[PDB]
């Protein structure tokens, strides 16, 4: 059979009769406007289809044509600086082809433009007659001044080269390579079609060693992330789950960035494409905007719900595609809780039985099969490069409660957990990461990096996390008993920790100096606030009881100029690099001598 | 272009339970199709087709199934989806919840027929809201400033004056130093609530541009679903197709979702929290994200939806899900209403996400971004100090925290408390805000850098 007939439509799902030779997760086109849908259940002759567009007006007599292929994306040049929807239709080309402001929900726009010409160059060390396997580079295309889009063979096939294209300008439809493999000759182009629900093949997984530098101080120091790791950001509304997402997409160490808006706001993706073409960064002494390494998968909350599933798998396929070139990809999914609400609404139409709080029983398997596509890993192919995929997925728990079937299922999968607090947002304490409940599991994986470049930082965070918990164990005493009955080794603990929460942990994202903090500034200003805690320890412990001693009341009136130096270490712009390391020690020599006097 | 085939009429109902009527032997039924039911006594009822399966079509009537026969009722299938007649003369009038005139008026002459579900805006051609709306209220304009094209709800409760501050921001809506067409959806309101909004818009002379849609509590609950849908597709017409700045006021949004729970529980759909459906986030976002402004047009649409949280709970499914879609909220509180503050606005759970682009040198002036963060920080510490003097004592606090006591009694009485008709400008608000920061020393204002302290704190 070639095509089908609608039997019933109820919301997103469509039951289609006369559909016998159809496989699961095939792509179909239901209706006269050809709405893109995917088969999820079939009972003999009738198949059930979730539709990625609005089914409003679909009648029973509508045809459902089958494509014989799953939901896939086109991978090639024309993808950096672009913005797509869940099923990878380019939003910049969909608004010039129609000249409207809406998506006409019928349009089969090609994902990569078949008219724009790219300047292909060969591998230079790939002659005719050379053997070639799946996943090795056979050409270099410079998509921008920053991105060299390395053209690769698909991982399925292999052969012997019979024709390679000379260097010149080519479309995405021009034949570039011919491979004879059995004595069969298959043509190739600069685009390849890969299904989004299939994990990309790769040589072997690798442990992660290099950290991901987000730019925030509480994120880089206390709960560090690696490139190739999995991160989850839960939190209620107004906590700042997009300010962590925007500061990571602007100032991380990652080669390419993708940003998947899954059930997000419409204004928050328009916010991205405004300030990104003006924010330039410096890689080779040249300045180029960060939109040339950015690609957006925009599926807002107004857009249909089944495309939230497709926008997640579209992104992680683009994330794994630039992984294979040797780049260090970082993916931000916002929000993964809206993907979970999509699976609940689809399974409610199929009358499936629910797991805890409405969600289907296969919720934790969908999340596990998405976070496990991340990792630092040696790619397929002969030039022997290495790439990585970092996934930082925002979770939106209902009511700000972390006992949630989406949040608690996520915390069993991810390794880094940045718990955002609402009480830290009710006061203007940004970023709102709750230092008590947050954790990381790359600690043992990163200290082999930390005894090479910053050889003093691991004893620092062991004390800084001890001071912040010592404050919390005494904060319950003050609100019940009172501050006047404390000891002197505890009043120094509460004030140094208050200096840590105000200078080190608080960070204004829109000011010109704290919008990015390099790691020498992070280790630097933490090395002085803990040495000040250790120097004030000896003022209390060594002179303990006998003499009329330093009792910390004389400290806060005599160190009022020195405490003002400690509270102002955050004001060091990137207009100075070497001077900031000196002023970290120039503040320390004031700290060195004042304990003697 | 036009449907010209004659509509079919079926006398073939096969099941009716709850609000759902099940029609059999329908030939090619259509999803989301609108129908017309003719009762055996002659009253006409409309209905949407919510499920079709082969020859069967499950409709739901808007006015309820009370009296629907099995042998004698006749349903007529209008061959298109629910499209409302929208026009430019659909302005200056009062309509009911469904579609009909109220003030002894004609039906609209229908410049075009727009689908009430609309279609989502492409995010590539949706320009970010930048210009600021001066509402005349210091708690709004000073700390949580709204932009033109911003969705921002009023988080209220039962008994609090949310309708009074709704009419206030309508009279005083203006650009920071050609009027706003207000479309008003009244949903599940009392009669005295609808008379308050009618007599306020007929008082300030703005009723030549008011599009008031009223839907009282005696009107059926299934018509509350299509009530914001019709009130936003005229605002979509006036702003994207008629080039005019529109302010949409939705009330009560709690009465929308409680009416949404009744239809979902009757269809036996999967519940989320507290019995509300799982698709409540999507249904709330299909009427919230129809706001903002587009690139090729000079008109815009801003949304201020009023909702009353049940039992003062901000973690209820109503204000939690609307807090995840909108761009910051306004929290009118109850404990500030007992002290006879007329806007009882607790600024600590209030937010405006688009306030940062709407403040600055070109927008109002230099110190707006800095005095708002400092007034927020001194109110946050002084309220935690207020919970300490109630448990320990009024005298044994830190000497700095007695200034925090003196700040809070001057914050809640001079800064936010302004009266029902006083419309301060944004430059008046920052001038009153610096007077309350004057009682603090210069070096305790930590969130303000030393540069702009020199220009404003000695005065």
């Amino acid at each position: 059979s070639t095509f089908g007939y609608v039997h019933g439509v109820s919301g997103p799902v469509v039951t289609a009769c006369d559909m016998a030779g159809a496989a699961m997760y095939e792509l179909v086109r239901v209706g006269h406007s050809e709405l893109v849908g995917e088969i999820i259940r079939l009972e003999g002759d009738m198949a059930t289809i979730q539709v990625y567009e609005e089914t409003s007006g679909v009648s029973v007599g509508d045809p459902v044509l089958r494509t014989g292929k799953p939901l896939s994306v086109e991978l090639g040049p024309g993808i950096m600086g672009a913005i797509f929807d869940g099923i990878q239709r380019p939003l910049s080309d969909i608004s010039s082809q129609t000249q409207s402001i809406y998506i006409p929900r019928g349009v089969n726009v090609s994902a990569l433009s078949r008219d724009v010409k790219w300047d292909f160059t060969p591998c230079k060390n790939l002659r005719v007659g050379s053997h070639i396997t799946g996943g090795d580079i056979y050409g270099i295309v410079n998509e921008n001044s920053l991105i060299k889009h390395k053209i690769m063979l698909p991982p399925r096939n292999r052969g012997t080269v019979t024709y390679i294209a000379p260097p010149g300008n080519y479309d995405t439809s021009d034949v570039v390579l011919e491979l004879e493999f059995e004595g069969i000759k298959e043509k190739f182009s600069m685009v390849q079609v890969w299904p989004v629900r299939q994990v990309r093949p790769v040589t072997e997984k690798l442990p992660a060693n290099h950290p991901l530098l987000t730019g925030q101080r509480v994120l880089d120091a206390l709960f560090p992330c690696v490139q190739g790791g999995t991160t989850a950001i839960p939190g209620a509304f107004g906590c700042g789950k997009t300010v962590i997402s925007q500061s990571l997409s602007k100032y991380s160490n990652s080669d390419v960035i993708i940003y998947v808006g899954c059930g997000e706001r419409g204004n928050e993706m328009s916010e991205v494409l405004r300030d990104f073409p003006e924010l330039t960064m410096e890689v080779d002494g040249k300045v180029e905007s960060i939109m040339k390494r950015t690609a957006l998968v925009a599926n807002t909350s107004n857009m249909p719900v089944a495309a939230r599933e497709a926008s997640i798998y579209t992104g992680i396929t683009l994330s794994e595609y630039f992984r294979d070139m040797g780049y260090h990809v970082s993916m931000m999914a916002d929000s993964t809780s809206r993907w979970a609400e999509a699976l609940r609404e689809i399974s409610g139409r199929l009358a499936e039985m629910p797991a805890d709080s409405g969600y289907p029983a296969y919720l934790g398997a969908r999340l596990a099969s998405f976070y496990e596509r991340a990792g630092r890993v040696k790619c397929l192919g002969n030039p022997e490069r290495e790439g990585s995929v970092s996934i930082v997925g925002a979770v939106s728990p209902p009511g700000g409660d972390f006992s949630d079937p989406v949040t608690s299922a996520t915390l069993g999968i991810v390794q880094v957990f940045w718990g955002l607090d609402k009480k830290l947002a009710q006061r203007k304490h940004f970023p709102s990461v709750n230092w008590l409940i947050s954790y990381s599991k790359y600690m043992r994986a990163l200290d082999e990096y930390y005894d090479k470049h910053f050889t003093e930082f691991v004893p620092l965070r062991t004390k800084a996390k001890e001071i912040l918990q010592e404050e919390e164990d005494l904060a319950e005493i003050v609100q019940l008993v009172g501050k006047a009955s404390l000891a002197e080794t505890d009043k120094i603990t509460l004030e140094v920790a208050k200096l840590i929460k105000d200078d080190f942990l608080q960070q204004n994202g829109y000011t010109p100096y704290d919008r990015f903090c390099p790691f020498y500034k992070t280790v630097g200003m933490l090395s002085n606030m803990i040495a000040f805690y250790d120097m004030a320890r000896r003022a209390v412990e060594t002179t303990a009881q006998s003499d009329n001693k330093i009792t910390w009341s004389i400290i806060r009136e005599h160190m009022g100029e020195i405490l003002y130096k400690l509270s102002s270490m955050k004001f060091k712009d990137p207009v100075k690099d070497g001077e900031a390391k000196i002023k970290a020690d120039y503040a320390q020599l004031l700290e060195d001598m004042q304990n003697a006097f | 272009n036009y449907l010209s085939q004659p509509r079919l009429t079926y006398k073939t109902v096969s099941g009716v339970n709850g609000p759902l009527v099940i029609l059999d032997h329908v030939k090619f039924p259509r999803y989301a199709e609108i129908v017309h039911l003719t009762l055996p006594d002659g009253t006409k009822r409309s209905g949407q087709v919510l499920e079709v399966s082969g020859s069967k079509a499950v409709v739901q009537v808007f006015e309820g199934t009370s009296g629907i026969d099995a042998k004698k009722t006749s349903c007529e299938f209008t061959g298109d989806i629910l499209r409302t007649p929208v026009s430019e003369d659909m302005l200056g009038r009062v309509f009911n919840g469904s579609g009909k005139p109220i003030d002894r008026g004609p039906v609209v002459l229908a410049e075009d027929f727009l689908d009430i579900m609309g279609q989502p805006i492409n995010p590539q051609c949706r320009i970010y809201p930048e210009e600021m709306i001066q509402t005349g209220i210091s708690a709004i304009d000073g700390m949580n400033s709204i932009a033109r094209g911003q969705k921002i709800p009023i988080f209220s409760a039962a008994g609090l004056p949310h309708n009074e501050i709704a009419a206030q921001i309508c009279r005083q809506a203006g650009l920071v130093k050609e009027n706003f067409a207000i479309v008003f959806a009244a949903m599940g309101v009392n009669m005295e609530t609808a008379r308050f909004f009618k007599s306020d818009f007929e008082e300030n002379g703005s009723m030549d541009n008011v599009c008031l849609f009223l839907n009282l509590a005696n009107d059926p609950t299934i018509e509350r679903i299509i009530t914001p849908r019709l009130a936003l597709t005229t605002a979509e017409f006036l702003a994207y197709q008629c080039e005019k700045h529109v302010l949409v006021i939705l009330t009560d949004m709690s009465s929308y979702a409680e009416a949404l729970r009744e239809v979902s529980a009757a269809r036996e759909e999967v519940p989320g929290r507290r019995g509300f459906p799982g698709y409540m986030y999507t249904d709330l976002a299909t009427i919230y994200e129809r706001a903002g402004r587009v690139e090729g047009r000079n008109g815009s649409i801003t949304q201020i939806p009023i909702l009353t949280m049940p039992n003062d709970d901000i973690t209820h499914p109503i204000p939690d899900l609307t807090g995840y879609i909108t761009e910051g909220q306004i929290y009118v509180d109850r404990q500030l209403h007992n002290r006879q503050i007329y806007p009882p606005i607790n600024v600590l759970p209030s937010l405006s996400r688009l306030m940062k682009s709407a403040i600055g040198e070109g927008m109002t002036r230099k110190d707006h971004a800095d005095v708002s963060n400092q007034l927020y920080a001194c109110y946050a510490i002084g309220k935690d100090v207020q919970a300490m003097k109630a448990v320990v004592g009024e005298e044994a606090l830190t000497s700095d925290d007695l200034l925090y006591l003196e700040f809070l009694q001057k914050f809640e009485r001079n800064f936010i408390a302004q009266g029902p008709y006083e419309n301060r400008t944004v430059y008046e608000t920052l001038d009153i805000g610096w007077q309350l920061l004057r009682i603090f020393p210069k070096e305790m204002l930590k969130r303000i850098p030393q540069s702009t302290l020199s220009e404003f704190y000695p005065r």
Binding site: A351, M353, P354 | E268, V270, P271
Partner: peptide, 18 residues
């Protein structure tokens, strides 16, 4: 309640055909 009512709705479906 939602799980047990869904079982009873499916139990009438198999009973009606059989």
């Amino acid at each position: 309640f939602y799980r047990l009512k869904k079982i009873q709705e499916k139990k009438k479906i198999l009973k009606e055909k059989s």
